[PDB]
PDB file of C-alpha atoms in Angstrom:
ATOM      1  CA  UNK A 270      11.265  36.708 -31.488  1.00 27.40           C
ATOM      2  CA  UNK A 271      14.577  35.371 -32.782  1.00 26.44           C
ATOM      3  CA  UNK A 272      15.632  32.476 -30.543  1.00 26.57           C
ATOM      4  CA  UNK A 273      19.237  31.886 -29.577  1.00 27.01           C
ATOM      5  CA  UNK A 274      20.447  28.378 -30.600  1.00 27.85           C
ATOM      6  CA  UNK A 275      20.476  26.562 -27.245  1.00 28.80           C
ATOM      7  CA  UNK A 276      17.494  28.533 -25.939  1.00 32.27           C
ATOM      8  CA  UNK A 277      15.470  27.079 -28.801  1.00 32.71           C
ATOM      9  CA  UNK A 278      16.899  23.548 -28.432  1.00 34.29           C
ATOM     10  CA  UNK A 279      15.605  23.360 -24.845  1.00 35.50           C
ATOM     11  CA  UNK A 280      12.337  25.013 -25.843  1.00 34.34           C
ATOM     12  CA  UNK A 281      11.764  22.335 -28.526  1.00 37.87           C
ATOM     13  CA  UNK A 282      12.810  19.593 -26.111  1.00 36.59           C
ATOM     14  CA  UNK A 283      10.341  20.797 -23.481  1.00 38.64           C
ATOM     15  CA  UNK A 284       7.612  20.728 -26.120  1.00 40.31           C
ATOM     16  CA  UNK A 285       8.222  17.039 -26.887  1.00 36.34           C
ATOM     17  CA  UNK A 286      10.155  17.349 -30.171  1.00 33.45           C
ATOM     18  CA  UNK A 287      13.164  15.187 -29.409  1.00 32.65           C
ATOM     19  CA  UNK A 288      12.623  11.952 -31.343  1.00 31.92           C
ATOM     20  CA  UNK A 289       9.057  12.866 -32.255  1.00 30.80           C
ATOM     21  CA  UNK A 290       8.201  10.367 -35.006  1.00 30.30           C
ATOM     22  CA  UNK A 291      11.864   9.359 -35.203  1.00 28.87           C
ATOM     23  CA  UNK A 292      13.155  12.909 -35.656  1.00 29.88           C
ATOM     24  CA  UNK A 293      16.006  14.018 -33.416  1.00 29.09           C
ATOM     25  CA  UNK A 294      16.088  17.489 -31.853  1.00 29.52           C
ATOM     26  CA  UNK A 295      19.152  18.325 -33.977  1.00 30.38           C
ATOM     27  CA  UNK A 296      17.089  17.763 -37.145  1.00 30.47           C
ATOM     28  CA  UNK A 297      14.351  20.134 -35.904  1.00 30.96           C
ATOM     29  CA  UNK A 298      16.990  22.722 -35.067  1.00 32.12           C
ATOM     30  CA  UNK A 299      18.532  22.319 -38.540  1.00 32.40           C
ATOM     31  CA  UNK A 300      15.048  22.814 -40.000  1.00 30.91           C
ATOM     32  CA  UNK A 301      14.308  26.023 -38.016  1.00 31.42           C
ATOM     33  CA  UNK A 302      17.788  27.378 -38.724  1.00 33.31           C
ATOM     34  CA  UNK A 303      17.443  27.087 -42.496  1.00 35.64           C
ATOM     35  CA  UNK A 304      13.734  27.916 -42.588  1.00 38.27           C
ATOM     36  CA  UNK A 305      13.697  31.141 -40.565  1.00 40.77           C
ATOM     37  CA  UNK A 306      17.039  31.617 -38.818  1.00 37.67           C
ATOM     38  CA  UNK A 307      15.104  30.873 -35.593  1.00 38.57           C
ATOM     39  CA  UNK A 308      12.732  33.801 -36.249  1.00 35.99           C
ATOM     40  CA  UNK A 309       9.100  33.381 -35.179  1.00 35.64           C
ATOM     41  CA  UNK A 310       7.888  36.401 -37.203  1.00 35.81           C
ATOM     42  CA  UNK A 311       9.365  35.096 -40.479  1.00 34.72           C
ATOM     43  CA  UNK A 312       6.994  35.057 -43.469  1.00 32.63           C
ATOM     44  CA  UNK A 313       7.504  34.336 -47.138  1.00 34.05           C
ATOM     45  CA  UNK A 314       4.928  35.169 -49.778  1.00 36.50           C
ATOM     46  CA  UNK A 315       4.817  32.782 -52.741  1.00 37.66           C
ATOM     47  CA  UNK A 316       3.402  34.925 -55.552  1.00 39.37           C
ATOM     48  CA  UNK A 317       3.104  31.918 -57.859  1.00 39.15           C
ATOM     49  CA  UNK A 318       0.493  30.068 -55.855  1.00 38.87           C
ATOM     50  CA  UNK A 319      -0.633  32.894 -53.550  1.00 40.58           C
ATOM     51  CA  UNK A 320       0.276  31.120 -50.319  1.00 42.44           C
ATOM     52  CA  UNK A 321       2.448  32.339 -47.445  1.00 41.97           C
ATOM     53  CA  UNK A 322       4.976  30.494 -45.262  1.00 41.27           C
ATOM     54  CA  UNK A 323       4.667  31.379 -41.568  1.00 44.91           C
ATOM     55  CA  UNK A 324       6.876  31.386 -38.484  1.00 44.23           C
ATOM     56  CA  UNK A 325       9.959  29.626 -37.249  1.00 44.12           C
ATOM     57  CA  UNK A 326       9.190  26.520 -39.357  1.00 45.44           C
ATOM     58  CA  UNK A 327       7.817  28.483 -42.365  1.00 46.25           C
ATOM     59  CA  UNK A 328       4.628  26.440 -42.464  1.00 43.92           C
ATOM     60  CA  UNK A 329       2.518  26.949 -45.596  1.00 43.61           C
ATOM     61  CA  UNK A 330      -1.027  28.379 -45.722  1.00 45.88           C
ATOM     62  CA  UNK A 331      -2.230  26.241 -48.626  1.00 50.00           C
ATOM     63  CA  UNK A 332      -2.462  23.210 -46.406  1.00 47.80           C
ATOM     64  CA  UNK A 333      -1.623  23.823 -42.738  1.00 47.81           C
ATOM     65  CA  UNK A 334      -3.037  27.075 -41.417  1.00 42.69           C
ATOM     66  CA  UNK A 335      -5.774  29.500 -42.387  1.00 41.32           C
ATOM     67  CA  UNK A 336      -5.103  33.099 -43.436  1.00 39.91           C
ATOM     68  CA  UNK A 337      -8.333  33.638 -45.392  1.00 36.12           C
ATOM     69  CA  UNK A 338      -6.405  34.763 -48.472  1.00 31.25           C
ATOM     70  CA  UNK A 339      -5.009  31.542 -50.011  1.00 33.90           C
ATOM     71  CA  UNK A 340      -7.306  30.209 -52.782  1.00 34.08           C
ATOM     72  CA  UNK A 341      -8.772  26.781 -52.135  1.00 33.20           C
ATOM     73  CA  UNK A 342      -6.509  26.229 -49.150  1.00 31.83           C
ATOM     74  CA  UNK A 343      -7.117  23.896 -46.234  1.00 31.45           C
ATOM     75  CA  UNK A 344      -6.307  24.251 -42.521  1.00 34.79           C
ATOM     76  CA  UNK A 345      -4.919  20.879 -41.396  1.00 32.57           C
ATOM     77  CA  UNK A 346      -3.430  22.163 -38.106  1.00 31.30           C
ATOM     78  CA  UNK A 347      -6.751  23.940 -37.518  1.00 29.96           C
ATOM     79  CA  UNK A 348      -4.889  27.120 -36.616  1.00 29.28           C
ATOM     80  CA  UNK A 349      -5.061  30.707 -37.828  1.00 28.85           C
ATOM     81  CA  UNK A 350      -1.698  31.445 -39.463  1.00 28.11           C
ATOM     82  CA  UNK A 351      -1.443  34.211 -36.862  1.00 28.13           C
ATOM     83  CA  UNK A 352      -0.828  31.431 -34.289  1.00 26.14           C
ATOM     84  CA  UNK A 353       2.404  30.686 -36.166  1.00 23.42           C
ATOM     85  CA  UNK A 354       3.696  34.221 -35.637  1.00 23.38           C
ATOM     86  CA  UNK A 355       3.756  34.190 -31.794  1.00 16.59           C
ATOM     87  CA  UNK A 356       6.969  34.406 -29.725  1.00 14.08           C
ATOM     88  CA  UNK A 357       5.662  31.319 -27.933  1.00 15.43           C
ATOM     89  CA  UNK A 358       6.130  28.419 -30.356  1.00 13.52           C
ATOM     90  CA  UNK A 359       3.809  25.871 -28.732  1.00 13.60           C
ATOM     91  CA  UNK A 360       1.163  26.197 -31.450  1.00 15.77           C
ATOM     92  CA  UNK A 361       3.792  26.102 -34.207  1.00 15.04           C
ATOM     93  CA  UNK A 362       5.275  22.951 -32.702  1.00 17.19           C
ATOM     94  CA  UNK A 363       1.845  21.310 -32.578  1.00 18.61           C
ATOM     95  CA  UNK A 364       1.523  22.138 -36.277  1.00 21.08           C
ATOM     96  CA  UNK A 365       5.031  20.836 -37.079  1.00 22.29           C
ATOM     97  CA  UNK A 366       4.073  17.577 -35.345  1.00 21.97           C
ATOM     98  CA  UNK A 367       0.951  17.423 -37.526  1.00 23.97           C
ATOM     99  CA  UNK A 368       3.070  17.993 -40.619  1.00 25.69           C
ATOM    100  CA  UNK A 369       5.375  15.048 -39.920  1.00 21.90           C
ATOM    101  CA  UNK A 370       2.493  12.746 -39.117  1.00 21.26           C
ATOM    102  CA  UNK A 371       2.125  12.616 -42.926  1.00 22.55           C
ATOM    103  CA  UNK A 372       3.909  10.073 -45.211  1.00 22.10           C
ATOM    104  CA  UNK A 373       6.974  12.235 -45.947  1.00 20.02           C
ATOM    105  CA  UNK A 374       7.859  12.966 -42.341  1.00 19.20           C
ATOM    106  CA  UNK A 375      10.564  15.618 -41.914  1.00 20.86           C
ATOM    107  CA  UNK A 376      11.029  15.454 -45.734  1.00 17.71           C
ATOM    108  CA  UNK A 377       7.887  17.610 -46.061  1.00 14.82           C
ATOM    109  CA  UNK A 378      10.231  20.599 -45.944  1.00 17.98           C
ATOM    110  CA  UNK A 379      12.375  20.798 -49.058  1.00 16.57           C
ATOM    111  CA  UNK A 380      14.832  22.919 -47.040  1.00 17.85           C
ATOM    112  CA  UNK A 381      15.438  20.015 -44.675  1.00 15.77           C
ATOM    113  CA  UNK A 382      16.320  17.809 -47.683  1.00 13.93           C
ATOM    114  CA  UNK A 383      18.681  20.466 -49.108  1.00 13.99           C
ATOM    115  CA  UNK A 384      20.360  21.504 -45.840  1.00 14.58           C
ATOM    116  CA  UNK A 385      19.885  18.756 -43.211  1.00 17.59           C
ATOM    117  CA  UNK A 386      19.314  15.377 -44.817  1.00 17.22           C
ATOM    118  CA  UNK A 387      22.536  13.345 -44.736  1.00 12.85           C
ATOM    119  CA  UNK A 388      24.427  16.288 -43.241  1.00 12.19           C
ATOM    120  CA  UNK A 389      26.210  16.698 -39.882  1.00 10.47           C
ATOM    121  CA  UNK A 390      23.536  18.337 -37.726  1.00  8.34           C
ATOM    122  CA  UNK A 391      25.047  17.449 -34.327  1.00 12.75           C
ATOM    123  CA  UNK A 392      26.452  20.961 -34.184  1.00 13.75           C
ATOM    124  CA  UNK A 393      22.931  22.388 -33.655  1.00  9.65           C
ATOM    125  CA  UNK A 394      22.468  20.907 -30.181  1.00  9.60           C
ATOM    126  CA  UNK A 395      26.048  20.814 -28.872  1.00 10.11           C
ATOM    127  CA  UNK A 396      26.429  22.497 -25.509  1.00  9.47           C
ATOM    128  CA  UNK A 397      22.690  23.030 -25.122  1.00 12.54           C
ATOM    129  CA  UNK A 398      22.230  20.454 -22.375  1.00 10.15           C
ATOM    130  CA  UNK A 399      19.596  18.543 -24.318  1.00 10.70           C
TER     131      UNK A 399
END
């Protein structure tokens, strides 16, 4: 499923993302936009370390979810990576919350640093009624 901008903004808001650990909804939108283009079925294979990035937030299998094919990986969100490929993003959001509960926070995603950190992300939630 490829969410429409505002559709996703309200979806994230309903799931408790707005201001979760100090992160505004606009930042989460900016993350999803650059990570997957709002696409829940997005996946990126990293041939170098044999891990795969899953879903709307492109969450990595080495640490966050289990796919049974990433060497010496852990499953911190205690989810099968399949859970991160559903149209319903509740499980993915629970995992994204787990990710930011770590020391880096939203900085865990290099894409957020490159495309959202110290940028104007207001645009992502304008007109969405959030």
